[PDB]
Structure formats: structure tokens, C-alpha cells
Amino acid sequence: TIKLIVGLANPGAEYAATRHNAGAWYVDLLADRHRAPLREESKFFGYTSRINLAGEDVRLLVPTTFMNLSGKAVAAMATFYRINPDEILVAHDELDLPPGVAKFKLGGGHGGHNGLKDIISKLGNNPNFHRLRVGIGHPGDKNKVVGFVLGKPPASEQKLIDDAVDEAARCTEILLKDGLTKATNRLHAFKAQ
Ligand SMILES: [Cl-]
Ligand SMILES: [Cl-]
Ligand SMILES: [Cl-]
Ligand SMILES: [Cl-]
């Protein structure tokens, strides 16, 4: 069961269009599709909502922390509602997947993502939460990652990411209603088959 879906972000209009906000794009779409608009809730350091997904009560969070303090919002909300790490799905931009691809993951490393690193920390050094990895591709120069994730994608890459986010939203209904195997069998086939 998933009780909390988190879309990682930096705050402000300055970052709303940047690759590092890709997880928030996903959560914004869930909010739109379930007619549950995200609104500031300062005790959880973010924007929150609540949706019915496949007959299950699921809370939404897009932090208003800087990305490196995402764990403060996720822990405050998870602790308040007595939600355990394994009941959290964290959506984030993923350098290791191309634009147009998304995958689910349970546990594993942060892939150098400053928001995942802070969540692992603030959940009690527990990496065993679900992730939605939204592919953004990688810069050619591994030195220039910050400039890349804090950049706006070109329109052709934005359209691919929007398509992957749309598919991941559709697969989230399946994840809640029929489980992680079924949701993964669909999502990981999206550009693979
Ligand atoms: Cl950052
Ligand atoms: Cl990762
Ligand atoms: Cl790219
Ligand atoms: Cl850079």
C-alpha cells in the first residue's frame, strides 16, 4: 500500500520549469486528474493534497524546501500521519534514464540526487521507500550535472518527459489497485516494447 506520494522540487518560479522539478510535475498531474488541488501546508514544509487512487486514500506532497532539505517535509508529514518509509512513493528526476522513460524502484542508492539523499537521512537512514524515476537524460560532461538539472529542457525533451509522466500517472492507478508487479510490467514496457 502507498499512503504518501512526494514530488521532489526546488521552490519558486525560477525552478518550476527545471529538470530537478520533474517529480513535482508528476504529482501536479495526479492532483489535476483527481481534482484535488495542491495547497501550502506550512507544518509539512510543502504543498499537500489528498486523492482517492483505486479506492485508497493517498496524500500528496510537493515540498517547498530546497531540494537538499526535502527530508524535512517528507519526515514531518510521514511522522504526523504514522506512514512508514515503505508506504511512501518519491518521484524524482533520474539522470540514468532518458527523456520519455520512467521506472518504479524500491530501495537502492540515491544516484547522487540531493533530495533522495536528504529523505534517506531524515527517514532514519532508510532508503527502502518506493521511487518513481522520471528520466531526464544526462549532460555529456559529467562535471556539469548541477547546471543540467537546474536547466529547462528543450521542447522536444519536455514533450517526452510529459508523455512519461502521463504514463506514470496511469500506472500509479494500477500500482494502488493491482500492485507493484502489474504497474512495473506496464510502465517499464512503455519505451521498451
Ligand atoms: Cl539543487
Ligand atoms: Cl535512483
Ligand atoms: Cl537530456
Ligand atoms: Cl555546472
Automatic annotation (TrEMBL):
PROSITE patterns noted in UniProt: PEPT_TRNA_HYDROL_1, PEPT_TRNA_HYDROL_2
Site positions for Stabilizes the basic form of H active site to accept a proton: D93
Keyword Metal-binding assigned: no
Record keywords: Cytoplasm, Hydrolase, RNA-binding, tRNA-binding
One GO process term, biological-process aspect: protein quality control for misfolded or incompletely synthesized proteins
Protein name listed in UniProt: Peptidyl-tRNA hydrolase
Catalytic activity: an N-acyl-L-alpha-aminoacyl-tRNA + H2O = an N-acyl-L-amino acid + a tRNA + H(+)
Pfam family, one: Pept_tRNA_hydro
InterPro entries per the UniProt record, alphabetical: Pept_tRNA_hydro (IPR001328), Pept_tRNA_hydro_CS (IPR018171), Pept_tRNA_hydro_sf (IPR036416)
Positions bound to tRNA: Y15, F66, N68, N114
Superkingdom per UniProt: Bacteria
